[PDB]
Design a protein around this ligand. Structure first.
Ligand SMILES: *NCCCC(=O)OC
Lengths: 75, 231
């Protein structure tokens, strides 16, 4: 299925996932589409921070739910 | 080289503030730029992180590059003027001593503080930079530690929300990067929400309102769980 990842800037990144996919897997997917490593990523689904090895279906995340990406960058 | 880099994480920044000896604040991460934060008021400042593309306002300029996280945060705190907020002895003594020093000399003094260097390092080629936004009297200022002076972005009030000016400046800064650049982070420095709920809870307790006390317990528990996930 497809789900949407929104960013601070307003951009919307679309992903090919299945409800079985781990959060960590979704982060791997954001890398190849964007360039940002998993390290620098936190995913929020209204409105908890999501745990790396704990599945979309686990968080009740559907076909075309929208998630939010925030960045952990070393300044 | 003797200062580590610091991750753009609202939990780390909340702890750095406390580490510097300042009480009454916390840091909240912003997730969208249209996020209404009316409920987070007062907002004491913003901390903004982006990729570096190479008299009433307190401001220090950096003389070391890797200090930018602590320096941006301190530039924000030393412009805070609020009953909610106590800077603590370390930061008050720093501000008093450096009151008539030029901006780069302030950076030097900050850099030589052992307490500040200690706190900073206890939390740690594209370069990512932190800058601060803060209101002072009727102006709104961007405090970029690479510049020699604060940058006035605009004027505010009477009705005014100062945050509109800052957010406008930040959006327009984002419009300078590839429409595909997404590596930014925005945090707001706000009053301690747990402390706010505990004050209200003790008042409703005194008023005999069990229902409101329980709901405040729920808010507090929610706040604690959120703080724990940031750990
Ligand atoms: N994030 C560490 C410091 C970088 C900075 O000062 O960029 C100019």
């Amino acid at each position: 299925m497809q789900i949407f990842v929104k960013t601070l800037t307003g951009k919307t990144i679309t992903l090919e996932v299945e409800p079985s996919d781990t959060i960590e897997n979704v982060k791997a997917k954001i890398q190849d589409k964007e360039g940002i490593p998993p390290d620098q990523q936190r995913l929020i689904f209204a409105g908890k921070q999501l745990e790396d090895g704990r599945t979309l279906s686990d968080y009740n995340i559907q076909k075309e739910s929208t998630l939010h990406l925030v960045l952990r960058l070393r300044g | 080289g003797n200062w580590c880099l610091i991750e753009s994480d609202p939990g780390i920044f909340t702890e750095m503030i406390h580490g510097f000896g300042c009480t009454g604040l916390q840091v909240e991460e912003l997730v969208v730029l249209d996020e209404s934060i009316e409920h987070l008021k007062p907002i004491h400042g913003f901390i903004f992180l982006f990729r570096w593309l190479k008299t009433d306002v307190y401001f220090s300029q950096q003389v070391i590059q890797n200090a930018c996280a602590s320096q941006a945060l301190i530039n924000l705190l030393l412009n805070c003027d609020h009953p909610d907020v106590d800077l603590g002895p370390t930061l008050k003594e720093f501000k008093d001593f450096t009151y008539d020093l030029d901006s780069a000399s302030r950076g030097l003094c900050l850099t030589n503080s052992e307490k500040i260097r200690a706190v900073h390092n206890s939390f740690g080629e594209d370069v990512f930079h932190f800058v601060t936004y803060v209101p002072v009297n009727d102006g709104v200022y961007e405090l970029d530690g690479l510049r020699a002076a604060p940058l006035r972005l605009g004027t505010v009030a009477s009705d005014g929300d100062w945050t509109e000016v800052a957010i406008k400046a930040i959006k327009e800064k984002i419009k300078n990067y590839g429409e595909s650049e997404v590596r930014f982070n925005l945090m707001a420095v706000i009053s301690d929400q747990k402390l706010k709920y505990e004050r209200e809870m003790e008042k409703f307790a005194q008023a005999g309102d069990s229902a409101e006390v329980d709901r405040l317990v729920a808010l507090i528990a929610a706040e604690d769980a959120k703080r724990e996930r940031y750990a």
